[PDB]
Amino acid sequence: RNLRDLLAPWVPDAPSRALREMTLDSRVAAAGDLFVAVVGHQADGRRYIPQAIAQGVAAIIAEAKDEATDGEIREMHGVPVIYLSQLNERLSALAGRFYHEPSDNLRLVGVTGTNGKTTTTQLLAQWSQLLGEISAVMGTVGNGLLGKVIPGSAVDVQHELAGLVDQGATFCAMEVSSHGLVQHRVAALKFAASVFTNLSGDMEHYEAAKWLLYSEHHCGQAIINADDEVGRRWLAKLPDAVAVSMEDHINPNCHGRWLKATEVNYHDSGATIRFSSSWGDGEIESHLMGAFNVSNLLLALATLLALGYPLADLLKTAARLQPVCGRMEVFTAPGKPTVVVDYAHTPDALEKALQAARLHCAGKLWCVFGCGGDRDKGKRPLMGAIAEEFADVAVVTDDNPRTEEPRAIINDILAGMLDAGHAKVMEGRAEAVTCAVMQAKENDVVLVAGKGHEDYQIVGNQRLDYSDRVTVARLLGVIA
Ligand SMILES: Cc1cccc(C(=O)N[C@@H](C)C2CC2)n1
Numbered sequence: 001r002n003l004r005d006l007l008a009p010w011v012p013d014a015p016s017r018a019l020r021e022m023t024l025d026s027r028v029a030a031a032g033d034l035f036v037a038v039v040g041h042q043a044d045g046r047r048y049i050p051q052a053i054a055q056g057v058a059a060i061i062a063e064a065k066d067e068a069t070d071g072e073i074r075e076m077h078g079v080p081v082i083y084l085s086q087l088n089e090r091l092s093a094l095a096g097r098f099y100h101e102p103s104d105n106l107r108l109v110g111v112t113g114t115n116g117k118t119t120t121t122q123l124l125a126q127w128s129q130l131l132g133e134i135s136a137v138m139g140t141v142g143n144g145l146l147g148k149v150i151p152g153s154a155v156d157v158q159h160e161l162a163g164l165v166d167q168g169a170t171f172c173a174m175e176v177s178s179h180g181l182v183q184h185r186v187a188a189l190k191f192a193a194s195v196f197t198n199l200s201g202d203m204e205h206y207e208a209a210k211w212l213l214y215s216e217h218h219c220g221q222a223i224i225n226a227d228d229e230v231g232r233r234w235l236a237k238l239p240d241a242v243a244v245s246m247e248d249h250i251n252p253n254c255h256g257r258w259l260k261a262t263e264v265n266y267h268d269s270g271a272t273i274r275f276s277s278s279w280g281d282g283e284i285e286s287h288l289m290g291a292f293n294v295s296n297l298l299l300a301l302a303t304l305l306a307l308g309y310p311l312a313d314l315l316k317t318a319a320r321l322q323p324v325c326g327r328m329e330v331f332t333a334p335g336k337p338t339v340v341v342d343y344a345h346t347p348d349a350l351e352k353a354l355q356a357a358r359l360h361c362a363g364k365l366w367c368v369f370g371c372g373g374d375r376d377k378g379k380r381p382l383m384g385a386i387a388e389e390f391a392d393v394a395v396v397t398d399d400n401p402r403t404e405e406p407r408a409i410i411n412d413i414l415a416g417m418l419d420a421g422h423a424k425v426m427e428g429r430a431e432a433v434t435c436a437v438m439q440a441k442e443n444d445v446v447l448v449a450g451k452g453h454e455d456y457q458i459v460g461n462q463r464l465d466y467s468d469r470v471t472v473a474r475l476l477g478v479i480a
């Protein structure tokens with residue numbers, strides 16, 4: 001890395017100077033670094049140019065606003081300071097060049113929308129890796145090669161993508177937040193494909209702002225959920241986008257690319273999804289639960305088809321796709337009730353989890369759950385009302401009671417019910433889980449909510465070793 005090569009597209013006359021790393025933080029700007037001095041909300045990095053210089057940086061790139069002209073080269077204490085107008089907008093491009101254009105050196109797929117980003121990215125990364133890629137993810141659960149995901153500016157994004165390319169990644173599925181997009185955090189990334197899952201006067205400016213952003217990015221193949229009203233607006237203006245539906249929203253008159261689920265059977269271990277597409281038809285056995293996960297899987301399928309992965313190979317590998325651990329994670333065993341472990345710990349999340357589970361439930365739906373002690377109490381009766389409404393059997397138990405009296409938490413939950421006497425209460429959590437699993441019938445479904453993959457139960461100030469997954473697995477005679 002050299003300042004002159006780095007800046008060649010923009011600043012013809014920039015001095016040669018070897019560079020080490022790129023940083024926005026004057027506090028970690030080491031000797032040989034490029035410090036980038038950006039102006040944000042209540043922050044002016046140019047204030048810290050003296051400090052960085054004093055810490056021995058090789059060079060500085062700085063916001064030109066009010067201070068200089070675009071491309072102006074100055075020199076302070078023998079250190080080149082190059083000024084650029086609209087530096088926030090350009091930071092992604094600058095960092096891209098610094099880090100050798102990582103998005104041109106793997107297949108990058110970006111997933112945007114309110115929900116489903118995490119699951120859809122995971123599915124993209126898993127399925128592509130099943131077809132021979134070395135895949136990675138960047139998103140809410142962290143960054144890394146699959147299995148090694150470790151728990152944010154335009155520089156950081158490019159740096160992390162370069163790290164992945166360095167570790168041998170050939171495919172990356174990235175969550176792209178609305179906030180990230182607006183703050184130019186992905187501005188110079190070359191997306192192979194861009195996926196839209198869903199959106200949760202005004203409508204004209206919102207739309208306008210997002211269209212403007214779209215027009216400025218390298219989105220690649222566009223893959224859009226046609227079951228969402230906003231998705232259909234995108235599709236109306238993008239004739240080469242791929243429309244995906246599990247209802248009747250594909251308009252066959254447009255002769256565009258499409259994928260639609262024609263029949264879905266939600267069963268005790270997943271969903272059987274029959275589909276047609278402009279690539280051919282097929283049937284997939286998904287091991288994920290609920291309708292929204294059928295949509296997420298279809299989006300991943302359509303994306304991979306769009307990118308040229310063969311339908312036959314995707315079909316042969318689909319049954320290996322797994323849920324994110326502790327997210328609507330299904331446990332079945334021959335002749336036992338189906339048990340779903342989900343992290344749902346809010347009224348809305350609990351409601352969605354119950355509605356998803358219900359689709360797969362021939363019998364009674366059980367819900368085992370509690371609420372955290374020494375935290376806001378407001379959700380407690382709301383979760384009680386939800387469990388009573390959307391399950392057939394509510395089993396109220398403990399969930400990280402901490403220092404709060406466990407039964408007091410349970411009381412708050414029960415207080416939200418129309419008919420609390422119809423709820424079952426069982427303390428200890430392990431005991432409650434066991435109660436549901438051992439009493440439920442073979443065609444029942446038991447949702448164990450609140451913990452997902454979090455393998456502890458906080459009682460007092462002790463983190464006790466405890467896993468919903470392991471509890472369930474042992475009861476069913478399976479392996480967590
Ligand atoms: C770009 C494309 C490809 C295939 C089908 C379609 C499609 O059904 N569009 C619908 C949802 C129109 C109202 C927006 N659009």
Ligand SMILES: Cc1cccc(C(=O)N[C@H](C)C2CC2)n1
Pocket residue numbers: 109110111112176181186191193194195196210213214217219222223224234
């Ligand atoms: C991943 C990504 C990056 C940059 C822009 C975009 C974008 O405007 N996406 C739209 C929602 C398009 C329907 C797919 N998506």
